[PDB]
C-alpha cells in the first residue's frame, strides 16, 4: 500500500546525457545512436536573443563550433541540422548505452518522468503532467535546458518533451523530441503567459480510486449522477468535461473497487461542493489532477520495466 | 523555479539490483563488489513466520539453496552469512557496475529516495522522509522486500534503508543496511504498530522558505517571536521542539530570503493557530514536512551528482 508521486527509473536516461556548448552557452543534449538533440537556442547569443533568426545563424555555424562532452570525453561533431526548435548534431561515436526508445508526442493531462540535468549531469528525478494549457509545473534552475521527460514501457524509453524556458509564472515549456513546441509558446523573449487552466477531471477520479484502494472511504456516498448531471457541475469548478471514453478508462478501476464511476462522480461533486472539511485524502488537502488511470493501476498493482 | 518532490537520479542503484530466490520466496537483493544484500526473511516459509529462529534457519541452509538471477544472467553464491536482520551472500562475481558507496544510517526527519523494485526490476523511484517515529510513509506492493533507499553525494551513493514490511496502518518499515530496524519493529508477525508520530518542525521551515525563494510570501507577517514562545505553540499543535542547531542550519535560506528564523516562526504561528484560509502554498493546502534545509538548498540553487 501507500501512493506516491512515482517517477520512472533514470538510469536508461542517465546514459543518454551529455553537455552541448555552443559559444558561451552551454546546455544539455541527448545522445541516442550516432545524434544528440538539443534546443536550437544553444546557437544564440546575449543580443540574438531577441528576435533571432535561425536558419541564419546555423548556416553561420561550422562542426568545430560544437563541443559536445559525454561525462570526460569529448565527442567529435560530424554534422549538424536543425528540426524545428531541435538542434541535430551527429557525432562520430553511436552512443553504447542507447536504449531502445521512441520520440511520442503526449497529450495534455498525460503524465511523465522528468530527469532535471545541469551541465549534462543528471540532478534529479520527477514526475509531472502535461497541463490543459501545454504547460509543465516543474522544477527547473538556470542550465536545464535540453532536460528530457519520458516514460518507459518494458525496455523502452518513450521520450516526450525536451525543456525549453520558463514562463513568467514559474511554470514551464518546451517541445517534444521533433522541435516542436507544447503550446502556443516559441523559444524566444516575447510576454508570451501561460493562459487559463483547468483541472483533469479524469485524473482526480483516478486518483479518488487509488484512495479507495489504499483504505480512504470517507468521501464516498450512496449518491450516484448522470454523466451530464456531473459536467455541469464540473464546468463551474473549472474542471474538464468527462467523455464516455474517460469512463471507459476508468472501468478496471471501477472493476476492483466495486464503485461505478458515475458513483464516483458523485462523491467529486460533492467533494467539489462542500470541500475536504479539514480531513485528507492520500496525505493531500487538496483534489490531485496529476496521477492518471494508468499512473493508479501501476502503482496499486506493481507493474516493472526491464 | 518550481519546486518539486525529487529523488536522486536512480542509474547508480538500478545497475545494483537483483533477484534473490530461496525456495520459493523471491524478492530483491543488493549487489556490491562480491555481495548480495537481501532481507534474511527470505529463508522464511509460509509456517515458519510466526516465531522464527534465523541462526537455526540459516545453518540447515547450503550456497546452493540461493539463487541470484542479476538480470538474465544467474550469479553463484560462494558463502553465506546474516548480519542482524540481513543475509549477505558472498557471489563469485563482483558487480562490474558497483558504484562508489557507503552504508549510513539516517536520523528521523532526514529525506532519501527509493527505489521499488520487484523481482530484482526497478519499478518507479521517488522521496520519502523518515518519520519520527521511525516510519516511512513509502510505496510498496508484495515483493517489493529488498528494495533500497538512499542518497547521492557527487559520485556516492549512501545506502541507508532496506524495506522489510508493512505495518498495519499501511506505513513501511525497514532497516539500514547493516540489518539494524529503524524503530521498534521486528521482521515478524507480531501486533506490532507505528505508535505516535510528530510534524517536523525545522523541515516545515525550510518549505516556508522554499515557498518564499519561489514567489509565495502571502503568509509572511511583521511579527517575529521568541525560540520559546515558539516552542509552545509547536507543542499544542504536535510539532517538535525547534532547537539553536536548527536556526543555525536554517541561516543559509534566511541570508538569501532576508527573512529571520524566528519571523519564519512567528508566521508558522499563525498558519497553525489560523489555517491556510482557503490558499495554498507551494501547491499544497497543507504544511509540508518533508523536505529538509538541504533539500531546499538543493533544489533552489541546482547542485548536480556524477
Not at 69 to 85: D, P, Y
Not at 111 to 129: D, K, R
Not at 254 to 265: E, F, N
Not at 282 to 296: I, K
Request: negative net charge.
Amino acid at each position: 500500500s501507500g501512493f506516491r508521486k512515482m517517477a520512472f527509473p533514470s538510469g536508461k536516461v542517465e546514459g543518454c546525457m551529455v553537455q552541448v556548448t555552443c559559444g558561451t552557452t552551454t546546455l544539455n543534449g541527448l545522445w541516442l545512436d550516432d545524434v544528440v538533440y538539443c534546443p536550437r537556442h544553444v546557437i544564440c547569443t546575449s543580443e540574438d536573443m531577441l528576435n533571432p533568426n535561425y536558419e541564419d545563424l546555423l548556416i553561420r555555424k561550422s562542426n568545430h563550433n560544437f563541443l559536445v562532452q559525454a561525462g570526460n570525453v569529448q565527442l567529435r561533431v560530424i554534422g549538424h541540422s536543425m528540426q524545428n526548435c531541435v538542434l541535430k548534431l551527429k557525432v562520430d561515436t553511436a552512443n553504447p548505452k542507447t536504449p531502445k526508445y521512441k520520440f511520442v508526442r503526449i497529450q495534455p493531462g498525460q503524465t511523465f518522468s522528468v530527469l532535471a540535468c545541469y551541465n549534462g549531469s543528471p540532478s534529479g528525478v520527477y514526475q509531472c503532467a502535461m497541463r490543459p494549457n501545454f504547460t509543465i509545473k516543474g522544477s527547473f534552475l538556470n542550465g536545464s535546458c535540453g532536460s528530457v521527460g519520458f516514460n518507459i514501457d518494458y525496455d523502452c524509453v518513450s521520450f516526450c518533451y525536451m525543456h525549453h524556458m520558463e514562463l513568467p509564472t514559474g511554470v514551464h515549456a518546451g517541445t517534444d523530441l521533433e522541435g516542436n513546441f507544447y503550446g502556443p509558446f516559441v523559444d524566444r523573449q516575447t510576454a508570451q503567459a501561460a493562459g487559463t487552466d483547468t483541472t483533469i477531471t479524469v485524473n482526480v477520479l483516478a486518483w479518488l480510486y487509488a484512495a479507495v484502494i489504499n483504505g480512504d472511504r470517507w468521501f464516498l456516498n450512496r449518491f450516484t449522477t448522470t454523466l451530464n448531471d456531473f459536467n455541469l457541475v464540473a464546468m463551474k469548478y473549472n474542471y474538464e468535461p468527462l467523455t464516455q471514453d474517460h469512463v471507459d478508462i476508468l472501468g478496471p478501476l471501477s472493476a476492483q473497487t466495486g464503485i461505478a464511476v458515475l458513483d464516483m462522480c458523485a462523491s467529486l461533486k460533492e467533494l467539489l461542493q462542500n470541500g475536504m472539511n479539514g480531513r485528507t485524502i492520500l496525505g493531500s488537502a487538496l483534489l490531485e489532477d496529476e496521477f492518471t488511470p494508468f499512473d493508479v493501476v501501476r502503482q496499486c498493482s506493481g507493474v516493472t520495466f526491464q
